Amino acid sequence: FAGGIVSQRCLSCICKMESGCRNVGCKMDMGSLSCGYFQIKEAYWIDCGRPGSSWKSCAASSYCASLCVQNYMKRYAKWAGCPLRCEGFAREHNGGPRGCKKGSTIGYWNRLQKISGCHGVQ
């Protein structure tokens, strides 16, 4: 995956959590599309610096999508008071810029760590 402040193992675990780490295309929930390996929505892509040619094309690339995640965490995680390890980054990914401070992402983190090889992932 793309390098940056998020570790490779953490990115793998988030990828497995979101899609079983596959390019699953774009899926609709509530009239809103979420796309690809990391299930990135348009707002997320815009804020992660619009890497690649477009949101949907970036989301379908393991590299571009993970670069987007790296850029998103670089932009938001520290400043939200998140721990700079996977617990923080996973919860930001699931919950937005303050996800690591919201109860709504606790189950996501608890469950992500049940994926084989992801317990206590940093």
């Binding site: 979420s34 929505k41 707002a43 699931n94 810029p97």
Partner: protein, 121 residues
């Protein structure tokens, strides 16, 4: 950036806007209430406005009576930018007699959960 104008059954008019220059995933929005007295120029008579945080992007506006006074409250629904797509919402009372005031807030709701039910429970 999100902008929408709605006419209330009373004739008052409301606009809802995301904050200018802000990111997509987080920031603020404002609600502005106008008398709507002159229908040719419905934003000419400002009454009051409020600025609130938004945890995501504004997804939709609803006008529904939540308190049972047979007038609609405004509900602003916001969708988290994270993969979980969690919903939050603020409800506002708005009428000629009292003006514009917040009525309730919910957050961390699953994507397909009924926001209105949550605001009433």
């Amino acid at each position: 950036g999100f902008f929408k104008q709605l006419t209330l059954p009373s004739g008052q008019v409301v606009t809802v806007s995301e904050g200018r220059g802000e990111p997509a995933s987080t920031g603020s929005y404002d609600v502005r209430l106008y008398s709507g007295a002159n229908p040719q120029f419905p934003l000419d008579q400002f009454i009051d406005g409020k600025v609130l945080p938004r945890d995501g992007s504004i997804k939709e506006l609803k006008l529904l009576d939540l308190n049972g006074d047979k007038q609609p409250e405004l509900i602003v629904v916001v969708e988290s930018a994270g993969s979980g797509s969690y919903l939050s919402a603020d409800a506002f009372t708005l009428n000629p007699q009292e003006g514009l005031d917040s009525f309730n807030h919910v957050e961390g709701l699953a994507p397909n959960e009924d926001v209105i039910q949550a605001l009433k429970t």
